[PDB]
């Protein structure tokens, strides 16, 4: 009924004698600069607006009530809050605010700021917030006590409010949450924006009198005096600037770079680990609201034309693994046949499900790697004909109208897109025309949010358990959240996610629910699976030291520090 730490599933790892995380050096020295790259551009400082392209790190301008550890899927520890009292079912919580908590101007962070902040999101925030927290109230019941009440049980929904940025009312009463900010807002975190050039760079400086520098959660972190982001229009120019020493650290997402271009003794450290944790996955989203992709058979046939084995062997040094789950590399992935609990959940909806949900394990198409896979292309032709798209001349045309089968692939100019022309060529050999349109970072963001595309690449970020966030990306009423990439409004999806959001905090029930959802999402071919790898490929100039232990769920760069003895050996 009163705790200092929370976890959505199970018990917090740091529930007892919590002085600092396992993955930090508590004695880490302060000072020095780390310079990072970002791709594309930015035009404002408000991560929470309805429009705009927010600057790098602008989702970390503010401290929150509790903050998550990085070696656990979802555990929360004191930051602005000291502790909380709560009901058994987590449907109400009273949070005690640290009386030392301060904004950057030295003014106190109070319960009224938290109440103001919740109402600000409810009335001027992204439209999914007021949908998720409809019926929730957040009330300052004392100068430093805030009471949160949910209209229905939602342990995760409660805990996720602990991650809300806490806004200073004295600043935000004069700015709509929905408007971009040309200038950084009054904030509170361990780093403050101190200079910038719109579209080019942002410099963060360490707040040397940060009120919380010595909380267990912050010990050994936030060590650099400044963090600089420099923007680059494409990744190849960024990679060449890295090797020239223009910034300090690179996460290598390109197989060819890693295989062939980390050359020149090279002083730069190269590091390949391996994360056994939940994985980000790449997909190509079918906009199923447009006629070209409304037939599941057409989406299946176009998926068959994507020859991953050829690409992996001929282009990518066999580095990649095929995406095949929305819960990739977790126990929630549907990699076995449905068990009895799953069939109880799925059989009621048998007539609105592909039959393969019950009889097969989902397997993205496999080719020989030779190119020109006969079996897969013949099957795509067979499916296209059945859906009414037939060859006249070289071009596939609708059987009744004669309209060509054609669509636009929308692409960020900034990415390496070696796979694109091989895919275009495969589709052309089926009589399908795919136009390629590369656009700038602000165009990509705007059109991705509005779903103004036929197809575009989308990253499905790691999801270690079936979180209530699933409804924002998949459920019918959240269709305009900007996270529903295919545009799907399905009562099958809705029913399974309604069950998932009613099983928050309950692993026993989420286990068959997540697998069941995985089957529905994969077997309907809403998106075309690309690839991932369970390796972190990193390189950095040798000016840093690191704790002995790396956190499970991030790279832990915020635990690194500037090593004056290593830096001294560099030019």
């Amino acid at each position: 009924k009163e705790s200092y730490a929370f976890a959505v599933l199970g018990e917090p790892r740091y529930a007892f004698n919590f002085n600092h995380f396992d993955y930090v050096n508590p004695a880490a020295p302060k000072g020095g600069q780390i310079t990072l790259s970002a791709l594309g551009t930015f035009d404002n400082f408000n991560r929470y607006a309805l429009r705009g392209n927010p600057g790098a790190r602008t989702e970390q301008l503010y401290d929150t009530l509790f903050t998550t550890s990085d070696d656990e899927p979802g555990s929360y520890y004191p930051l602005i809050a000291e502790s909380a009292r709560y009901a058994d079912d987590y449907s109400w919580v009273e949070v005690a605010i640290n009386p030392r908590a301060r904004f950057h101007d030295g003014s106190p962070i109070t319960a009224r700021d938290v109440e103001f902040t919740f109402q600000k999101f409810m009335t001027e925030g992204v439209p999914q917030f007021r949908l998720v927290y409809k019926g929730t109230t957040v009330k300052a019941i004392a100068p430093l006590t805030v009471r949160i009440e949910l209209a229905k049980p939602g342990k995760e929904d409660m805990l996720s409010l602990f991650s809300l940025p806490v806004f200073p009312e004295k600043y935000w009463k004069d700015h709509k949450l929905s408007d971009p900010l040309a200038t950084p807002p009054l904030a509170s975190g361990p780093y403050r924006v101190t200079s910038w050039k719109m579209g080019q760079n942002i410099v963060y400086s360490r707040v040397k009198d940060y009120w919380a520098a010595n909380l267990p959660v912050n010990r050994g972190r936030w060590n650099f005096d400044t963090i600089r982001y420099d923007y680059y229009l494409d990744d190849n120019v960024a990679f060449e600037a890295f090797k020239a020493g223009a910034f300090d650290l690179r996460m290598e997402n390109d197989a060819k770079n890693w295989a062939t271009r980390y050359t020149g003794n090279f002083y730069i450290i190269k590091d390949e680990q391996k994360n056994e944790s939940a994985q980000d996955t790449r997909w190509l989203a079918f906009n199923i609201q447009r006629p070209v992709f409304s037939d599941r058979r057409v989406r299946e046939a176009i998926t068959l034309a994507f020859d991953f084995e050829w690409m992996n062997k001929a282009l990518f040094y066999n580095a990649w693994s095929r995406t095949n789950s929305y819960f990739q590399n977790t126990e929630y992935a549907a990699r076995n046949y449905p068990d009895a609990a799953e069939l109880v959940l799925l059989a009621p909806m048998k007539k609105d499900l592909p039959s393969e949900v019950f009889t097969q394990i989902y397997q993205p198409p496999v080719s020989k790697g030779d190119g020109y896979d006969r079996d897969n292309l013949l099957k795509a032709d067979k499916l296209l004909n059945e859906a009414g798209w037939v060859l006249k001349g070289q071009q596939r045309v609708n059987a009744t109208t004669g309209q060509p089968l054609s669509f636009e692939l929308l692409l960020p100019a900034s990415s390496n897109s070696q796979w694109v022309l091989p895919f275009q060529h495969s589709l052309q050999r089926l009589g399908i025309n795919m136009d390629i349109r590369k656009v700038d970072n602000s165009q990509i963001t705007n059109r991705m949010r509005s779903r103004d595309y036929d197809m575009m690449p989308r990253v499905w970020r790691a999801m270690p358990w079936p979180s209530s966030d699933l409804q924002i990306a998949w459920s019918s009423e959240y269709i305009n959240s900007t996270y529903n990439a295919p545009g799907v409004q399905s009562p099958v999806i809705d029913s399974l996610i309604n069950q998932i959001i009613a099983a928050q905090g309950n692993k026993e029930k989420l286990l068959p629910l997540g697998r069941a959802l995985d089957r529905v999402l994969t077997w309907n071919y809403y998106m075309l699976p690309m690839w991932y790898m369970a390796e972190d490929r990193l390189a950095w100039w040798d000016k840093f030291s690191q704790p002995a232990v790396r956190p499970i769920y991030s790279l832990g760069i915020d635990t690194w520090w500037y090593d004056v003895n290593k830096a001294a050996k560099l030019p």
Binding site: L50, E59, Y133, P165, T445
Partner: peptide, 7 residues
């Protein structure tokens, strides 16, 4: 996803 638009 509840507090900001995709990037």
């Amino acid at each position: 996803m509840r507090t900001g638009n995709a990037x």
